[PDB]
């Protein structure tokens, strides 16, 4: 398996458990610091990073009734410049640029208590696919599916329903949506960290997934595995293999990685392309920092880059 060693450039530092890299509609960059604590309790933060200086600004420190959040993954909305943030303690949050936020759900479409989420992915239809490796959201005692199979997958639809689409995952983590060339969502990829597997489903419609399959295999016997992921314009899936020092590159058909990217650190967490460029911003937990490197091509357009009223 060929390995490339592109130059990694420092972006920002000292961000506890750096995760959820994301760009909004104005090209602003954001990162989440899920591991920030205040007296042993969760006090996670959502930060805006100045790309010119690397200076950090905490725009939101979500807390619902005294229970601080553990924000872990982000996606930018299209019809409004707002962030949908997966929180391991609070579920799904919608965060504005001014720093205000709203907690989307305490319960799913079935009246079942919501589970703490880790990452999410918008499909071109506007539906949000979310991974939920944690147990029930606050006030319930914090638990996570690293050992037991209680991790779930949700789909927050356009009509506002929080639908649980699957369960029994051992820490579902990264998530991405594969689209047909005409923009139709047709395949969902879900990372299951400890088991070193990438799972796939055929998306038949909003919140409708079928034919669960072990799509790809993550290298290594190290503690960790597939964390964050994202597609490039040619539909190759780059996955952060936490603990391996590499970001794995999968072809459209999955299986074994067709290339690996060596990072000058052991714990790559999440990654995100900068709109209209080959630049991939990567968060890592060895030093708890953010980096950037040039990939072989542009990233797949995120939902926020598409046009609602576009003709073509």
Q: Check binding of 230 to Ca ion (CB under 5 A).
A: yes
19 among annotated binding-site residues: yes
- Looking only at the bridges linking them, the beta strands covering 259-262 and 3-4 are parallel
173 among annotated binding-site residues: yes
Nearer to Ca ion, 91 or 312 (CB): 91
- Adjacency order of strands within the sheet including 237-242: 3-4, 259-262, 246-250, 237-242, 225-231
Residue nearest Ca ion, CB atom distance: 272
Pick the piece of the chain touching Ca ion (CB under 5 A) from 50-58, 184-192, 271-279, 284-292: 271-279
Site pattern 186..225 for Ca ion (x: CB under 5 A): ----------------------------------------
272 among annotated binding-site residues: yes
- Annotated active-site residue 285? The verdict is yes
Asked if residue 15 lies in contact with residue 288, where contact means CB atoms within 8 angstroms, the answer is yes
* Residue given tokens 């960059």 in the structure block: 29
Pick the piece of the chain touching Ca ion (CB under 5 A) from 6-14, 105-113, 168-176, 178-186: 168-176
Segment 55 to 94, residues that bind Ca ion, using CB under 5 A = none
Shortest Å distance, C-beta 272 to Ca ion: 4
**Catalytic residue (choose from 179, 217, 222, 285):** 285
Rounded CA-CA distance 251/253 in Å is 5
Shortest Å distance, C-beta 273 to Ca ion: 7
CB-based contacts of 221, cutoff 8 Å, min separation 6: none
Site pattern 94..133 for Ca ion (x: CB under 5 A): ------------------------xx--------------
119 among annotated binding-site residues: no
Shortest Å distance, C-beta 176 to Ca ion: 8
Shortest Å distance, C-beta 34 to Ca ion: 9
Distances in Å between the Cα of 200 and the Cα atoms of 48, 210, 217, 220, 246 are 32, 9, 12, 20, 22
Q: Helices marked H in 139-234 — which ranges?
A: none
* 194's tokens: 């400890």
Burial 250-261 (b: 16+ CB within 10 A, else e): beeebeebebbb
Distances in Å between the Cα of 55 and the Cα atoms of 9, 58, 291, 308 are 15, 10, 14, 33
Judge residue 286's burial from the number of C-beta atoms within 10 Å of its C-beta, 0-12 exposed, 13-18 middle, 19 or more buried.
Answer: middle
Q: Check binding of 272 to Ca ion (CB under 5 A).
A: yes
Q: Check binding of 232 to Ca ion (CB under 5 A).
A: no
Q: Check binding of 285 to Ca ion (CB under 5 A).
A: no
Q: What angle do CA 30, 33, 37 make, to 5 degrees?
A: 150
Annotated binding site for Ca(2+): 19, 118, 173, 227, 230, 271-272
Annotated binding site: 19, 118, 173, 227, 230, 271-272
Residues in contact with Ca ion by CB under 5 A are 118-119, 173, 227, 230, 272
- The residues that are catalytic are 285
């Amino acid at each position: 398996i060929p390995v490339i060693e592109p130059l990694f450039t420092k972006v920002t530092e000292d961000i506890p458990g750096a995760e959820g890299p994301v760009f909004d509609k104005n090209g602003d960059f954001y990162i989440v610091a899920p591991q920030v604590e205040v007296n042993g309790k969760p006090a996670g933060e959502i930060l805006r990073i100045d790309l010119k200086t690397g200076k950090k600004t905490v725009i939101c420190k979500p807390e619902v009734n005294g229970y601080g959040g553990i924000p872990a993954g982000c996606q930018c909305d299209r019809d409004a410049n707002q962030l949908f943030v997966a929180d391991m303690r609070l579920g799904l949050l919608v965060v504005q640029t001014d720093g205000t936020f709203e907690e989307i759900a305490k319960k799913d479409s079935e009246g079942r208590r919501m589970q703490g989420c880790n990452d999410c992915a918008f499909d071109y239809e506007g539906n949000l696919w979310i991974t939920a490796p944690a147990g029930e959201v606050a006030p319930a005692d914090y638990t996570r599916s690293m050992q037991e199979k209680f991790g779930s997958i949700y789909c927050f639809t356009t009509d506002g329903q929080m639908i649980q689409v699957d369960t029994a995952f051992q820490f579902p983590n990264g998530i991405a949506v594969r689209h047909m060339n005409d923009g139709r969502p047709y395949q969902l990829i879900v990372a299951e960290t400890p088991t070193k597997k990438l799972w796939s489903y055929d998306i038949k419609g909003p919140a409708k997934i079928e034919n669960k399959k072990v799509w790809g295999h993550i290298p290594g016997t190290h503690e960790g595995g597939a964390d964050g992921m994202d597609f490039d314009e040619d539909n190759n899936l780059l996955v952060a293999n936490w603990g391996s020092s590499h970001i794995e590159v999968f072809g459209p058909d999955g299986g074994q990685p067709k290339m690996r990217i060596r990072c000058p650190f052991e714990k790559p967490s999440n990654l995100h392309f900068k709109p209209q460029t080959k630049t991939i911003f990567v968060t890592e937990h060895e030093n708890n920092a953010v980096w950037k490197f040039e990939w072989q091509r542009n990233g797949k357009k995120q939902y926020c880059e598409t046009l609602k009223f576009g003709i073509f």
